[PDB]
Amino acid sequence: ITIISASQTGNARRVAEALRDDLLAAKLNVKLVNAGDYKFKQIASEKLLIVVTSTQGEGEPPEEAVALHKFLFSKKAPKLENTAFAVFSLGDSSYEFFCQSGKDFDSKLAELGGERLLDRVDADVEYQAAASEWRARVVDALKSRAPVVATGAVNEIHTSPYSKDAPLVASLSVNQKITGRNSEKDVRHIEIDLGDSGLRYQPGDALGVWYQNDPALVKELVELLWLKGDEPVTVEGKTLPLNEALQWHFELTVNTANIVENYATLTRSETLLPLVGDKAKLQHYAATTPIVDMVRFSPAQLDAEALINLLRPLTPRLYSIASSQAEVENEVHVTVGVVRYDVEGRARAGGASSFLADRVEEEGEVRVFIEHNDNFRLPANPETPVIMIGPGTGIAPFRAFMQQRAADEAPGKNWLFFGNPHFTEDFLYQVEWQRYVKEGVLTRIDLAWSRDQKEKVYVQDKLREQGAELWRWINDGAHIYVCGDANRMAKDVEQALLEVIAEFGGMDTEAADEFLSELRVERRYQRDVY
């Protein structure tokens, strides 16, 4: 933000100073320069340019602004592309040309391509009236609602005031374990109350969930480094106790090759030095050793700033939305697989998933936003058939699909392929599926239980078993959806779809692949895999 003051007896400067003190209290973009010193030749690169000028000699500018005026009214003045500006004008009404100077600058700057931030404002002798409120909306219009440099806070969600950087403060209503006692996995059905926010979402969207690290994990980490936890550290320019920085502001539950390498170097660890510069060794160590355990295994003294400088900022996690608002109204449901594992007998857990499962009380606060996915959507035609492939937690959006199609009483046929280790332990939402089958909403359902018999069975095996009927549905205009594990499931499922298409469509592998690519183009093959 560049405030140019053009003044003869200092009134315009008093205003422009009154504006340097406002912006100074708001944004970090404020610099006050006199017109007589302003290097106008480089003006095009002004991101935010506010002019405060009085008027002299029948509309003549103040003396100090005369060169700047001639250079803007000159045949050689620069066109402006990324310049936002405003103009406040001072003068005396009794004169023929009231506020010529301020008028000139306002007209000419926009005529060079400058983005008019506010409408120009004039004022007579008694100017602390018009000036006191102009200075007001400028600070607002020059806040995040029209930024350039300092503080932006820009996000994207339908027409909402809520976004990833300004999330909704919601509350946790339901937190329920939906895998059986003998499951190898902890899966939670989560209902979050949206209150009166008006936050909206469609099936296929995901929920962005901010979280905090486990205070126990922060404490274990802080101790192993021989810190106590109240050491001050700088986080985004402000000063926090270490514990608060670690709990709220940095990733602790994900290790990376870079972190291993940096930590090896900082500590000269004999265990870790040998991995330095070997990307595959570093990645493998990160993947098997959480940060807190890397520290255990390679003790070293680090001060608080050295630790926090090691870490990446904390980021929210996404969770496919498992409800339809037509059915649940001012709520959002998710299906959370809690990452739980052990390192030499010490319990470890993913940050967000264990935050929701273990560290938020009923009615407890949860900060959320919507991640819109326009490329994962039910057909617009309520009669088009729908094929859904979502084993594990990939089941979530298909709960939302069926809540929606049932709410709309869509007559389209629906087909679910689901899979997990055990029928008696891992049939997520079994009793709802039975109800959908009973009610005629869920037309077909095929299940793959990978650990209920000797040989492994997965959804791709049921896709192959169902080849003939799948191809029939595909020729009836069916949309195919795949949600869940990217690394293995989505690939094996795509391979099985290609085999079905090749076989029952009578084409070779390259033709099947082009056919599936045509379904993508047609938005009839959509995936949300992660």
Ligand X SMILES: Cc1cc2nc3c(=O)[nH]c(=O)nc-3n(C[C@H](O)[C@H](O)[C@H](O)COP(=O)(O)OP(=O)(O)OC[C@H]3O[C@@H](n4cnc5c(N)ncnc54)[C@H](O)[C@@H]3O)c2cc1C
Contact 100, 69 (CB under 8 A): no
CA separation for the pair 218, 223 (Å, rounded): 9
Q: What residues between 200 and 219 interact with ligand X by CB under 6 A?
A: 206
> Minimum distance from CB of 53 to ligand FMN (Å)?
8
Place of tokens 């209290």: 25
Q: Across the beta sheet with 386-389, what order do the strands follow?
A: 444-449, 414-420, 386-389, 479-484, 525-529
* Residue 57 is assigned to a ligand binding site: yes
- Residue 87 or 246: the one with the smaller Cβ distance to ligand X is 246
Find the binder of ligand X among 53, 267, 298, 335 (CB under 6 A).
335
Q: How far is CA 326 from its chain centroid? A: 25
Structure tokens that stand for 409 in this block: 């009483």
The one of ligand FMN, ligand X, none whose footprint includes residue 98, by CB under 5 to 8 A per kind, is ligand FMN
Q: How many residues bind ligand X, per CB under 6 A?
A: 23
Dihedral of CA atoms 230, 231, 234, 239 in degrees, nearest 10, equals 50
For the chain, first and last CA: distance in Å?
42
CA separation for the pair 169, 276 (Å, rounded): 43
* Residue 95 is assigned to a ligand binding site: yes
Dihedral sign (CA 22, 28, 33, 35): negative
CA separation for the pair 417, 446 (Å, rounded): 5
Kindly state the DSSP code that residue 31 receives in the 8-state scheme.
E
At 179, the amino acid letter reads: T
Contact 304, 241 (CB under 8 A): no
The one of ligand X, ligand FMN, none whose footprint includes residue 419, by CB under 5 to 8 A per kind, is none
Residue 253 binds ligand FMN (CB under 6 A): no
- Residue 128 or 309: the one with the smaller Cβ distance to ligand FMN is 128
Residue 196 binds ligand FMN (CB under 6 A): no
CB-facing half-sphere around the CA of 282: CA atoms within 13 A: 16
> Minimum distance from CB of 87 to ligand FMN (Å)?
14
> Minimum distance from CB of 104 to ligand FMN (Å)?
12
Q: What residues between 374 and 393 interact with ligand X by CB under 6 A?
A: 393
- DSSP E strands in 102-230: the ranges are 115-116, 168-177, 186-193, 206-209
* Residue 59 is assigned to a ligand binding site: yes
Residue 36 binds ligand FMN (CB under 6 A): no
Residue 530 binds ligand X (CB under 6 A): yes
Q: What residues between 390 and 419 interact with ligand X by CB under 6 A?
A: 393, 396
Residues 277-296 as x/- pattern, contact with ligand X by CB under 6 A: ----------xx-x------
> Minimum distance from CB of 42 to ligand FMN (Å)?
25
- Residue 357 or 500: the one with the smaller Cβ distance to ligand X is 357
- Window contacting ligand FMN (CB under 6 A); options: 91-99, 319-327, 355-363, 398-406: 91-99
Dihedral sign (CA 299, 301, 304, 307): negative
Ramachandran assignment for 523, one of left (phi > 0), alpha (psi -120 to 50 degrees), beta (any other): left
CA separation for the pair 209, 319 (Å, rounded): 8
> Minimum distance from CB of 93 to ligand FMN (Å)?
7
Find the binder of ligand FMN among 2, 3, 4, 7 (CB under 6 A).
7
Find the binder of ligand FMN among 34, 44, 95, 172 (CB under 6 A).
95
* Residue 353 is assigned to a ligand binding site: yes
Find the binder of ligand FMN among 71, 98, 248, 515 (CB under 6 A).
98
- Window contacting ligand FMN (CB under 6 A); options: 3-11, 176-184, 266-274, 473-481: 3-11
CA separation for the pair 266, 261 (Å, rounded): 9
Q: How far is CA 127 from its chain centroid? A: 45
Structure tokens that stand for 397 in this block: 């959006």
> Minimum distance from CB of 240 to ligand FMN (Å)?
45
Kindly state the DSSP code that residue 301 receives in the 8-state scheme.
-
Beta carbons within 8 Å of 488's beta carbon, 6+ residues apart: none
Beta carbons within 8 Å of 117's beta carbon, 6+ residues apart: 48, 50, 84, 85, 86, 138, 141, 142, 146
- Window contacting ligand X (CB under 6 A); options: 21-29, 125-133, 351-359, 362-370: 351-359
Residue 92 binds ligand FMN (CB under 6 A): yes
- Residue 131 or 321: the one with the smaller Cβ distance to ligand FMN is 131
* Residue 444 is assigned to a ligand binding site: no
* Residue 460 is assigned to a ligand binding site: yes
Place of tokens 């392929």: 417
Find the binder of ligand X among 341, 424, 432, 440 (CB under 6 A).
341
- Window contacting ligand FMN (CB under 6 A); options: 54-62, 65-73, 241-249, 433-441: 54-62
Which CA distances in Å does 440 have to 315, 368, 401, 414?
Answer: 41, 34, 14, 9
Residues that constitute the known binding site for FAD = 253, 287, 317-320, 335-337, 341, 350-353, 530
Footprint of ligand FMN on this chain (CB under 6 A)? Answer: 7-12, 54-59, 62, 90-92, 95, 97-99
Footprint of ligand X on this chain (CB under 6 A)? Answer: 206, 253-254, 287-288, 290, 317-320, 335-337, 339, 341, 350-353, 393, 396, 528, 530
Residues that constitute the known binding site for FMN = 7-12, 54-57, 59, 90-99
